[PDB]
């Protein structure tokens, strides 16, 4: 079987050096695992980076290099640029299968950190009229692009009935995401207070409303 493990998010500044690692549950990574590294940019734009443990693919900048550092494969970016902000996936050739890591989100700080603008909107009367109630929490202008969204109904944690989009990149390079709580107008009328709680870089922004 084998599970491939990667850091889930790393943050560096432009000009700094960062190292991403790739480990396997079947023990040490070796040469015969041919570690591959690739890059995902916004809109399913994939670029091969490193082949066979350390070969740069065609036209990859020399600041990207791959190596084994102990029992692990690593990707080292020497002198990281803002355009290296992306998801980096490693894969290993094991028992005649390419097996993928979960991908690392790398932030390369191209601008100041930015806290989210959170807006929570009530269901419209026109929707209630259809026997339904959707609450909308829009979250915009945050950077780094990593956010956790929680929903509270009268203080109780909501565990079912919500949907949150993966963070998406804005044209000014900050990030946005939306979250939805859908209830029937009858569950809507059974509770007074609703909250959308967004945590960004250890701090929580909470937006609440009452029926």
């Amino acid at each position: 079987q084998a599970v491939v493990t990667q850091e889930s998010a790393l943050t560096t500044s432009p000009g700094e050096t960062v190292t991403l690692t790739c480990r396997s549950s079947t023990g040490t990574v070796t040469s015969g695992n041919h570690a591959n590294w690739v890059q995902e940019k916004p809109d399913h734009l994939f670029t091969g980076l490193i082949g066979d443990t350390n070969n740069r693919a065609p036209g990859v900048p020399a600041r990207f290099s791959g190596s084994l550092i102990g029992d692990k494969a690593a990707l080292t970016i020497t002198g990281a640029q803002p355009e290296d902000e992306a998801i980096y996936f490693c894969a290993l050739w094991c028992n005649n299968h390419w097996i993928f890591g979960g991908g690392t989100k790398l932030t390369v700080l191209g601008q100041p950190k930015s806290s989210p603008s959170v807006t929570l909107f009530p269901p419209s009367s026109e929707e209630l009229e259809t026997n339904k109630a959707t609450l909308v929490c829009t979250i915009t202008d945050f950077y780094p692009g990593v956010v956790t969204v929680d929903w509270k109904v009268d203080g109780t944690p909501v565990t079912q009935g919500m949907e949150t989009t993966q963070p998406s990149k804005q044209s000014n390079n900050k990030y946005m995401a939306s979250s939805y709580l859908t209830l029937t107008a009858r569950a809507w009328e059974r509770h007074s207070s609703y909250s959308c709680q967004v945590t960004h870089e250890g701090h929580t922004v909470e937006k609440s409303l009452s029926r």
Binding site: H44, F46, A91, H97, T119, S124, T134, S178, Y180
Partner: protein
Amino acid sequence: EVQVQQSGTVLARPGASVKMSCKASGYTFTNYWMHWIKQRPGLEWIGAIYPGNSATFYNHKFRAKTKLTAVTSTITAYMELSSLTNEDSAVYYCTRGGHGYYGDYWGQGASLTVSSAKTTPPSVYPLAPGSMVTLGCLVKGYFPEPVTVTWNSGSLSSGVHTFPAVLQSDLYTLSSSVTVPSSTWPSETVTCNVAHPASSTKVDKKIVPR
């Protein structure tokens, strides 16, 4: 230069099968492996074909599901997926591979959606609150993708955020917001315009105070 060209978006029903294609350009097809990659919101390797001697490698998990072929004559590789389920909805990529790697150059990905839902128009709702004010529109319950959203027929371009669709009960939902100066609304009207080409829907929603 090297280009891996993929076929387009596919829509399919449960139980059905589909063939996707990938054409090679800027290199000799017969010396490289064409691999296929599944992305579902994680990545998974399906398998790979060597067109010079038609050898293939499969992931065991996909052996019952996929069939890989290649025509060295038309420089196209193919993947057949059969007995489609919703779990096969994903974006699929073909990639060029050689010794020790599977993908230096990647195709752009072909999107596949497996659904038994029919073509449904969106229901559009205005999102009023009641310094700057944020207004929104909710585009609920449509199939298939896409819908386009403009604000004031395209006049309001600045400060607009249209979010990616999420699937709720097998239909899509999307929302769009606009932030405008608070002295500007309700005085200068704000309308969202939603079009859903598959059902030839074009609907306008004026945002009104609550």
